[PDB]
């Protein structure tokens, strides 16, 4: 059976931090999209430039699947033309985006009692990201006049910060697993 491995992305045991978001290329396969959405769970399902029902019409199947974890409050930033710490410094979608954004609450997986400090996000960055740019650097951010030379301190901050997902957080602070499919037509 030559079906596209959409299970390896949506069903991954571990998801990537948003600043180092994962990308999986899916090509040369027959994609069954109708059943993909069918799993009644996805709290967020929004497509741009394409209709989800009419994706089985596309002859080919050559799609990028980007996956990461953010706050519930930050789900709304995964969209064209959005601003904020995630859309500006972590994961930027273009204005002419052709694809779908899929997200679901994962508080039952990505939160620990003492706080799951494995998921990070970029807090400081001088300029916004280009669309689909991936900045994995953790150079000490110079917030002030004097340089840092890799040394932390005042006006010299580590650019990444952790979520610390706890199960007792509200849904805005709870973790959501996001999958972004990028289509080509």
């Amino acid at each position, epitope marked *: 059976t030559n079906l596209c491995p959409f299970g390896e992305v949506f069903n991954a045991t571990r998801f990537a931090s948003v600043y180092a978001w994962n990308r999986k290329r899916i090509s040369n396969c027959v994609a069954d999209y109708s059943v993909l959405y069918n799993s009644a769970s996805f709290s967020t399902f929004k497509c741009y430039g394409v209709s989800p029902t009419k994706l089985n019409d596309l002859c080919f199947t050559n799609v990028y699947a980007d996956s990461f974890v953010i706050r519930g409050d930050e789900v709304r930033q995964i969209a064209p033309g959005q601003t904020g710490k995630i859309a500006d410094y972590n994961y930027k979608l273009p204005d002419d985006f052709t694809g779908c954004v899929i997200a679901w609450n994962s*508080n*039952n997986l990505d*939160s620990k009692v*003492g706080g799951n400090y494995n998921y990070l996000y970029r807090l400081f960055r001088k300029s916004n990201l280009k669309p689909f740019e991936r900045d994995i650097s953790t150079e000490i951010y110079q917030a002030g006049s004097t340089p840092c030379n890799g040394v932390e301190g005042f006006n010299c901050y580590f650019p990444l910060q952790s979520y610390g997902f706890q*199960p*007792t*957080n*509200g849904v*805005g602070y709870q973790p959501y697993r996001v999958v972004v499919l990028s289509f080509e037509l």
Partner: antibody
Amino acid sequence: QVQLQESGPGLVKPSETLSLTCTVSGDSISSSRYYWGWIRQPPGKGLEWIGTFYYSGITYYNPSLKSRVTIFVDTSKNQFSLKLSSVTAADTAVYYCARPRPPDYYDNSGALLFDIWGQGTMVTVSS
Amino acid sequence: AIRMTQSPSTLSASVGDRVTIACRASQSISAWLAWYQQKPGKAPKLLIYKASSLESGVPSRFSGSGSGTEFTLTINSLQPDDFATYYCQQYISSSPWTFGQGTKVEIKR
């Protein structure tokens, strides 16, 4: 309205395992959408948070109670349990099953408070 | 583990007085503090959450305030039914020693 009710043996011999059960009663409300915990109170003493069950594999246990605490939630029967092994006279207390109040949208807290309680059951550890 | 300190431990007030109970935290817990009322032979009853938000079904005469390390529960117009032991509980982090020692309010008659 959600109602809790403890049930279990009021007498446990030393070094045995305490076992209590709290049954969730409500308007067809599922126990899968809430967290459940246990709180005890020795006679004439304060309140000690034993632990709370959030999801399967994501549970909190009072570290002062070591590794002898286990809490399981049965979502098809709407009831949860408390297991306390290697009991001594220091474990004789009134045990409450409580429900941590669900947090609001923007709540950032590390733990929670308990808004719904059971009636409490008195367990005596004695020979 | 953050330790909570209630003061006083016991108090006695007449009917209609204005009772004040103070709860002190060893370190700042922001505003994640709750107040409980426990009557004899009963389970504790949640009165206040987030230091000041009142629970549904609690009389308006109960009120709470505070932030950081020191908090205050206020009982306006004390009623004879208000005889109970009151606990404050920090929930900034799941840790041992989460409740205070309790304040037992006696009614003066």
